[PDB]
Amino acid sequence: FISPMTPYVPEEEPTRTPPSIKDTGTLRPASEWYPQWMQYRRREDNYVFWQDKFMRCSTDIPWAEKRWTLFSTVWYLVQQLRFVGTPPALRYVAFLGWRALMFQVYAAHKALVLWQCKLDAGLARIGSGGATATFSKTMALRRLHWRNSPLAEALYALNLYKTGRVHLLPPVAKPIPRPTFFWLF
Amino acid sequence: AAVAAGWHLASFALNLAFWGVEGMPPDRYWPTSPRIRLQIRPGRYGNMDGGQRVYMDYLARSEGVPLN
Amino acid sequence: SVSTVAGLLLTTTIVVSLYGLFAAVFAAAGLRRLAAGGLLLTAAASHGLFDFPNPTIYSLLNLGFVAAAVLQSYFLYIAPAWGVNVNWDTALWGPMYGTAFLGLVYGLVALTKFDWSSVVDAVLRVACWFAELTMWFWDTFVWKFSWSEKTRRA
Numbered sequence: 001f002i003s004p005m006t007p008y009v010p011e012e013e014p015t016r017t018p019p020s021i022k023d024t025g026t027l028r029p030a031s032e033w034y035p036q037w038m039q040y041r042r043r044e045d046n047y048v049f050w051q052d053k054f055m056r057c058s059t060d061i062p063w064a065e066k067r068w069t070l071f072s073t074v075w076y077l078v079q080q081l082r083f084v085g086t087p088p089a090l091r092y093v094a095f096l097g098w099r100a101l102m103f104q105v106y107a108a109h110k111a112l113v114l115w116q117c118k119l120d121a122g123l124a125r126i127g128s129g130g131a132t133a134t135f136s137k138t139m140a141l142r143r144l145h146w147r148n149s150p151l152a153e154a155l156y157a158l159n160l161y162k163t164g165r166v167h168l169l170p171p172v173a174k175p176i177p178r179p180t181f182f183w184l185f
Numbered sequence: 186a187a188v189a190a191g192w193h194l195a196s197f198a199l200n201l202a203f204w205g206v207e208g209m210p211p212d213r214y215w216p217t218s219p220r221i222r223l224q225i226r227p228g229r230y231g232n233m234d235g236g237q238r239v240y241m242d243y244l245a246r247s248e249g250v251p252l253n
Numbered sequence: 254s255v256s257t258v259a260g261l262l263l264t265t266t267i268v269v270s271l272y273g274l275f276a277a278v279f280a281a282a283g284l285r286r287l288a289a290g291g292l293l294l295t296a297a298a299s300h301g302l303f304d305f306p307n308p309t310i311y312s313l314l315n316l317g318f319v320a321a322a323v324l325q326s327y328f329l330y331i332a333p334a335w336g337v338n339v340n341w342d343t344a345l346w347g348p349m350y351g352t353a354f355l356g357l358v359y360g361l362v363a364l365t366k367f368d369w370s371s372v373v374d375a376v377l378r379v380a381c382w383f384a385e386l387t388m389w390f391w392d393t394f395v396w397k398f399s400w401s402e403k404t405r406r407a
């Protein structure tokens with residue numbers, strides 16, 4: 001009745017906590033404590049670093065993460081064994097090992113993204129003859145930040161391979177909501 | 186025998202890596218005092234004035250001081 | 254309906270006598286069929302009493318029911334001692350004895366109000382007496398309750 005142009009997109013409650021303010025989003029390990037951009041911001045405006053810890057862990061918990069289920073009942077045992085059942089020394093050495101492995105896998109993913117840029121240029125030549133031979137740097141950063149679905153990747157690759165159009169990009173993939181199955185999970 | 190003793194030594198080394206209290210949150214279900222955990226209070230029968238002296242001496246010995 | 258003890262006896266009567274008719278009539282020799290044809294009259298009387306609807310309509314039916322239940326519980330009960338045998342035909346001879354039994358316990362569960370309340374009260378009394386016996390046995394032989402329980406005021 002009161003149709004406001006754009007079809008009303010219902011805004012459901014969030015099911016996952018928003019990612020931390022120290023995150024990178026690129027499979028690279030985050031910093032140890034301080035996210036290193038604070039030094040390029042003014043003091044007493046960096047108050048939102050602890051205001052991320054609050055409302056990421058105390059005051060703005062989504063109610064989909066407070067659901068009690070059989071899977072969460074089982075998973076509490078894993079988390080309890082991790083936190084109060086395993087010594088922090090062994091947790092620290094495992095944390096160092098995971099940090100090194102994640103740095104290595106980030107370097108591997110960065111090299112894979114650069115090779116996908118080269119493949120982007122190749123597929124953009126085969127499909128537009130020889131004219132378009134560039135590649136989309138925004139799509140490169142989109143692949144690096146894991147913002148693309150496999151369907152979007154395949155559609156973009158096919159689009160390059162048979163019409164070119166490097167700077168015509170697929171839509172950004174929405175975040176995956178937390179799955180819920182009644183009392184099971 | 187070395188395998189059995191090695192299992193016991195691995196458990197002891199895990200406890201050594203636990204070491205102290207660091208890394209563990211305080212727990213509202215498990216306070217550090219069993220009198221807190223249960224409901225144990227002294228009442229009218231049993232408590233007497235001299236008991237303060239005896240309590241002082243026991244607390245001095247438990248803290249480790251040779252004064253009374 | 255099936256929510257009262259007298260209703261239980263009535264339903265039972267209906268079921269039994271239906272099986273009786275279906276085992277004798279559906280399956281001085283003709284008296285073996287006449288006495289089983291009367292089982293359907295018994296079922297009709299019990300379906301009448303199933304809604305026992307002003308009670309004064311079914312009061313005289315109840316009186317005739319209990320009086321002829323007493324008469325059947327005389328005749329069939331003294332039948333083996335008077336010469337005739339009952340064990341021969343099970344599927345014929347059974348349901349008349351059964352409906353006479355249910356009829357007599359109807360004249361006991363109806364005459365005195367009874368109801369599920371007295372059954373629950375008797376079950377609770379028996380369980381309560383056995384409970385006090387169990388507590389005494391435990392406190393005297395197994396473990397004193399002053400030892401088992403938690404002494405307060407510490």
Ligand SMILES: CCCCCCCCCCCCCCCCCC(=O)OC[C@H](CO[C@@H]1O[C@H](CO[C@H]2O[C@H](CO)[C@H](O)[C@H](O)[C@H]2O)[C@H](O)[C@H](O)[C@H]1O)OC(=O)CCCCCCCCCCCCCCCCC
Pocket residue numbers: 082086090091093094095096097098099101
């Ligand atoms: C200079 C010192 C010399 C040694 C230091 C470095 C050398 C060797 C490092 C450890 C051995 C190899 C580690 C490789 C994989 C990590 C193992 C693991 O499963 O992963 C461990 C994870 C990672 O740590 C935590 O991990 C969290 C969860 O992230 C990850 O957690 C999991 C990682 O397994 C999942 O993969 C999940 O997908 C991913 O999100 C956080 O993100 C943080 O990274 C951090 O808090 O911990 C957990 O949850 C589990 C906690 C207990 C597991 C203990 C495993 C190993 C313990 C060795 C003890 C021997 C002591 C002698 C010293 C010599 C060492 C061999």
